Amino acid sequence: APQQINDIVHRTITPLIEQQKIPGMAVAVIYQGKPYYFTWGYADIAKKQPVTQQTLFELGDVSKTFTGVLGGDAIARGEIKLSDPTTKYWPELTAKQWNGITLLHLATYTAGGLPLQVPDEVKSSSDLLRFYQNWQPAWAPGTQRLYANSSIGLFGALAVKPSGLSFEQAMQTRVFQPLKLNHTWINVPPAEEKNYAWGYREGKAVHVSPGALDAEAYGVKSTIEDMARWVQSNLKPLDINEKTLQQGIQLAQSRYWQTGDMYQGLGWEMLDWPVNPDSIIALAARPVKAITPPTPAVRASWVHKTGATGGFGSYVAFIPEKELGIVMLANKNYPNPARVDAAWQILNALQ
C-alpha cells in the first residue's frame, strides 16, 4: 500500500492492539475506491492460526446493515412499504399496543421501547408471537429511540415474508450473491470452519450462540475482503447493476430520525461530515425528531455501525463524498470509543 496508508494504519492500530490486548485483528481501508488490507495476530491462539484476509469474524451488530439493505431492496421491489402496519405482515399480532406501529418503527428502534434482547427462553415461532403480544410499550410509537435487536430483528423477519424465502435465502440471493460476497455467511459451512476465528472473552475461546432473530440482528460472519467489498458497495451504490439492490442501499442511508447530531438509517447510522470524535452504555433512551420526509442519502456524511458479540468487536465507517472507508474486525469485544477514535484518526489523516 501507499506509504501514507501503511503508516497511519500501523501507527494507529499497533497501539490499539497493545492497549486493548486484542488477540487478532484485520483492517481494510478503502481509499479512492481501492481496498488495502492489514492483519495482525491470531484467529485461534491455541492452534496458532494467524489472522489472514480469509479469516471469518463475527460481525455482531454490523449485521444490521445487511438487514437494513435487504429491507430496502424489498421496499424497492414493491414487496413491503415502511409505512405499512406491522400487522399487515403478521396478522396474528392482535394485541392492541400494535396499532400504529409500522415497519419503519421496527427498523429504526422507535416502536416504543422494544427490548434490546429477545429472551433466551424464546425459541419457536409460537414463543416469538407470544413475546411480542405480551410486550408493553413504555412510549407511543415514533417518540423515542431505544436500540434493540428485537426491533430490527422483527423488521428483518417480516420484510422477507412476501418474497416467500427464508431470511437467510433472501439475504444470499438478493444481497450476498449480487455483490460477490462469497465468504459471507449467516451459518458458517463446515468447509469454511478452518477460517472461522475464535472470539475471546475473559481469555476463553467463544462463538456466538444460536438465538431467536439472531441472523437478522447479529449473526453474520465475514472476511475483511468481503467487508471491504460491502463498504465499496455502500460508498458507490450506482455501480451496482441490480436495480432494486442499488435502490435498497440508497434507502438504508436515508435519514429517518434525528437524535442529537446523529441520524438513523436502516441499519446504518449517520452524522454530517466534517465531524469530530466526541460527537460520534446498557440502555440509552433518547427522544427522536422525525425527518418528514426522510432525507435521501447525504454524500457528506460519516456513515457507520459498531458491532459486538461476546467474543468479537467490529466497526465500519465510510464517507461517500470522499470515497473513503474503513473496516476494523477483532476477536475481542473491546470498548466502542477506542474503535471510533482509531477509525477517525485513520480516515481524518487520509483527507
After which residues does the chain show a gap where C to N exceeds 2.5 Å?
Answer: 280
The one-character DSSP state at 213 is T
Number of continuous H segments (helices) and E segments (strands) in the chain: 11, 16
Contact assessment for residue 117 and residue 138, using Cβ atoms and an 8 Å cutoff: no
Question: Residue 169 is placed in which grid cell?
Answer: 435465502
CB within 8 Å of 307: residues ≥ 6 apart: 59, 60, 61, 62, 63, 64, 218, 313, 314, 315
Peptide bond between residue 274 and the one before it cis (omega within 30 degrees of 0): yes
Angle, nearest 10°, between helix axes 243-252 and 224-235? Answer: 90
The one-character DSSP state at 186 is S
Peptide bond between residue 293 and the one before it cis (omega within 30 degrees of 0): yes
Question: How many angstroms separate the CA atoms of 26 and 35, rounded?
Answer: 13
Question: How many angstroms separate the CA atoms of 79 and 300, rounded?
Answer: 30
Bridge partners of 85? 102
Residue with cell 458458517: 188
Q: Can you give the resolution of this entry in Å?
A: 1.5
CATH 3.40.710.10 at 1-351, yes or no? yes
Could you tell me how many residues make up the chain? 351
Q: What b-and-e string marks burial along 210-224, b requiring 16 or more CB atoms within 10 Å of the CB?
A: ebbbbbbbbbbbbbb
The one-character DSSP state at 280 is -
Question: How many angstroms separate the CA atoms of 218 and 66, rounded?
Answer: 10
Query: Which runs of E-coded beta strand occur in the chain?
Result: 24-31, 34-44, 49-50, 57-58, 144-145, 199-201, 204-206, 221-222, 255-259, 262-264, 269-272, 286-287, 289-295, 301-309, 312-319, 324-330
The one-character DSSP state at 208 is P
The 10 Å Cβ neighbour count of residue 2 is 12
The one-character DSSP state at 84 is S
Q: Is 121 exposed, middle or buried (0-12, 13-18, 19+ CB in 10 A)?
A: exposed
The one-character DSSP state at 47 is T
Helix, strand and coil percent figures for the chain, each rounded to 5? 40, 25, 40
Per the entry, the structure determination technique was X-ray
Give the chain's radius of gyration (CA, Å).
Answer: 19
Contact assessment for residue 223 and residue 183, using Cβ atoms and an 8 Å cutoff: yes
The one-character DSSP state at 296 is P
Residue with cell 438465538: 211
In the chain, where are the structural domains located? Answer: 1-351
